[PDB]
Structure formats: structure tokens, C-alpha cells
Paper text:
Here we show that the same σ–(c-di-[name])–anti-σ switch has been co-opted during evolution to regulate distinct biological functions in unicellular and filamentous bacteria, controlling type IV pilus production in the genus Rubrobacter and the differentiation of reproductive hyphae into spores in Streptomyces. Moreover, we show that the anti-σ likely originated as a homodimer and evolved to become a monomer through an intragenic duplication event.
Crystal form 1 was solved by selenomethionine single-wavelength anomalous diffraction (SAD) and refined to Rwork/Rfree values of 17.3%/20.2% to 1.86-Å resolution. Indeed, the structure shows that the single-motif [name] from [name] is homodimeric, with helical residues 45 to 83 forming a tight antiparallel homodimeric coiled-coil with overall structural similarity to the monomeric twin-motif [name] from S. venezuelae. The formation of the homodimeric RsiGRr coiled-coil buries an extensive 1,904 Å2 of protein surface from solvent. The same RsiGRr crystal forms were obtained in the presence of c-di-[name] under identical crystallization conditions, but no nucleotide was visible in the structures. This appears to be due to the presence of Mg2+ ions, which were required for crystallization for both crystal forms.
Numbering used by the authors:
A (entry chain C), B (entry chain B): 23 to 98
The structure:
Amino acid sequence: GSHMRESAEEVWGGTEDLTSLSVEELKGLMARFDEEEKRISYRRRVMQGRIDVIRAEIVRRGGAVLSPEELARVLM
Amino acid sequence: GSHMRESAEEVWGGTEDLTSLSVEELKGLMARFDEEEKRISYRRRVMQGRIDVIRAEIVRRGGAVLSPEELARVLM
Ligand SMILES: [Mg+2]
């Protein structure tokens, strides 16, 4: 447990003016948000790869269940 | 096989060959993965904006607590 120590999200949401934070505090915020950005980017790459494989497999079947634009825009 | 109530992640991990799935099953997978990719892309945009604001605020101070490369790579 955190023992009520503030999370990066809570510090960020509760700060009216960043000028009131120290550089050490700002660097902690930036580090936390940067880590989340990197985790998201890794997961986006996984999702894009799976979508690419699925879309190629649907196209491979040479059917007409879905139109070209439904495939391109993922209108399912 | 039928009415197994599997999640998209479970279907994906448990399918050795996508030719075993119906087009309707592939549609559902594509839709779930596309929705997830859009959801975390939105969150990524938020994280990138917060990082941009924090980095500008540290630069604004005109100090030397952090080097240029430390700021550029978020090394903390
Ligand atoms: Mg900037």
C-alpha cells in the first residue's frame, strides 16, 4: 500500500501551476507519464500486428461478406 | 467449440490457424483489437501532451539540474 502518498496522477490533477513544483517533482511526473506512454506504444504495436494478420486472412478468403471500405475502416 | 464464451484474447491465443475461424469470428476479433488500439492511442496522446508541458516547464526555469539529453530521453 501507498500509505496515502500521492500518485503522479493525483499530483498532476491537483497542481494549479507547475511553477510550484520542484524539478525533482516534475521529473518524477515526467518519468511516470513516459513509462505509461512506452507501455501503450508496445501494446499498440501488438494490436496493429494482430489487426494486420486478421485483415490479411479475411482478404485471403476472396469473399464478399465485407466490403473494401468496411475492411479498411473496421466497420464490423 | 460452440458457445464457449471465450474472450478475444483467449480466442487469439488458442487459435493455431485462423483458417479455422468464421468470417464473423474474425470480424469480432478485429473489432475488439481495433477498439483497444484506438482507446490506448487516445491515452497516448494525453501522456504525450503532459510530457510536453512538463518538459517545457523544466526548460522554462533556465537551470542545469538536468542535461539536454536527460530531458530529451526522460532519463531520471
Ligand atoms: Mg514542446
